[PDB]
Amino acid sequence: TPYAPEPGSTCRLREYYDQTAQMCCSKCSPGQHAKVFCTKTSDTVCDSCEDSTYTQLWNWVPECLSCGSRCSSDQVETQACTREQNRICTCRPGWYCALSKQEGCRLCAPLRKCRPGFGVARPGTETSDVVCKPCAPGTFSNTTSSTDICRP
């Protein structure tokens, strides 16, 4: 609702200052492109953005952001690109990413190939390595795959 501000009073959250009518109105929630701005009567009319475009903060911009298209013939998505997020890539299934970047670490690395007699702590496939520590028999350990923990 177009609630009028008064001198020495701050407009509440989710309302900014709209200068076209000099009156603060409600802010559309993240996931919206303000297509009509505030007037003396008309509040901000919310409407969702298109695909592969978003806004991560309660916005009034008439244009939405842009996520990526694909990471590679490999490098599947570990996080989809919806209306409230970005296409967070990974460095292919069964490969650990040891470097870092905004999403795509410039260097990935093979998941691991450590011999029977190594126990892979945890992949940390997003930003870490599986590691390989002895567990030499463990319960049953006679496989070189290293994709699996000490199990048979």
């Epitope: 590679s72 013939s73 490999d74 490098q75 890539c89 460095c91 470097l99 410039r106 260097l107």
Partner: antibody, heavy 119, light 107 residues
Framework: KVQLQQSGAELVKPGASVKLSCKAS????????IHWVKQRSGQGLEWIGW????????NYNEKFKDKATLTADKSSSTVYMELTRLTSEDSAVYFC????????????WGQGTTLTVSS | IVMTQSHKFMSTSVGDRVSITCKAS??????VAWYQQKPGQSPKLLIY???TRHTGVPDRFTGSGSGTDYTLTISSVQAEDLALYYC?????????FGGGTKLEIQR
């Protein structure tokens, strides 16, 4: 567009060490990483080490782990390598390359730095 | 990973077929590339990411692999193709390079 251009040949009394400047342009400096692989004529490419621009991570190659110096300047978009006490053996052709995407492949290459060591 | 080039000087005639046998010490899976260098010229990337041809590269060069004895092929041979040919993996932090190749016409 990882454009890589390199300086020409340099000659200095053995014992001193020079710091190179592999100037690069056409792509954001941090989002790319520039390695160091020299091309001594008659010798295959041998990788001196790699340096992270954005996160300032460094991994000097075990052959050059100490004697090399993979420094860089952020503003100039240039990696600065110094090979301590340039010797006649170290006197050679130097190259710097990089990648554009997330899994490395040297899609780009430098012009080829050159170095000569004699008196 | 010590990437090598088993061929450093081939024999071929114009418009013939030959295969390079870039060889490594450890597997790289889809982490192979392809670099060609005319003498005195900055090297160019030929094929990257297994078989994915680099942008604006002549078709005649084709090949891929997923093991340790990588191989591609060339269908048509021209005098300009005579050059230095090597590769470089993308596997672990020690990148290396093949020794090189030198296509040589047999007239």
């Amino acid at each position: 567009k990882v454009q890589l251009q390199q300086s020409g040949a340099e000659l200095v009394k053995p014992g001193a060490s020079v710091k190179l400047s592999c100037k690069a342009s056409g792509y954001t400096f941090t989002e790319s990483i520039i390695h160091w692989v020299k091309q001594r004529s008659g010798q295959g490419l041998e990788w001196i080490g790699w340096f992270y621009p954005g996160s300032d991570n460094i991994n000097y190659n075990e052959k050059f782990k100490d004697k090399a110096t993979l420094t860089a300047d952020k503003s100039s978009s240039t990696v600065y390598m110094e090979l301590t006490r340039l010797t006649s053996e170290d006197s050679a052709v130097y190259f710097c390359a990089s990648h554009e995407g997330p899994y490395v492949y040297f899609d780009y290459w430098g012009q080829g730095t050159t170095l000569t060591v004699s008196s | 990973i010590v990437m090598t080039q088993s061929h450093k000087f081939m024999s071929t005639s114009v418009g013939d077929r030959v295969s390079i046998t870039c060889k490594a010490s450890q597997d790289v899976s889809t982490a192979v590339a392809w670099y060609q260098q005319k003498p005195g010229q900055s090297p160019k990337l030929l094929i990257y990411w297994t078989s994915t041809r680099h942008t604006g590269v002549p078709d005649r060069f084709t090949g891929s692999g997923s093991g340790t004895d990588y191989t591609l092929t060339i269908s048509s041979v021209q005098a300009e193709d005579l050059a230095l040919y090597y590769c470089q993996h993308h596997y672990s932090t020690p990148y290396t390079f093949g020794g090189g190749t030198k296509l040589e016409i047999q007239r």
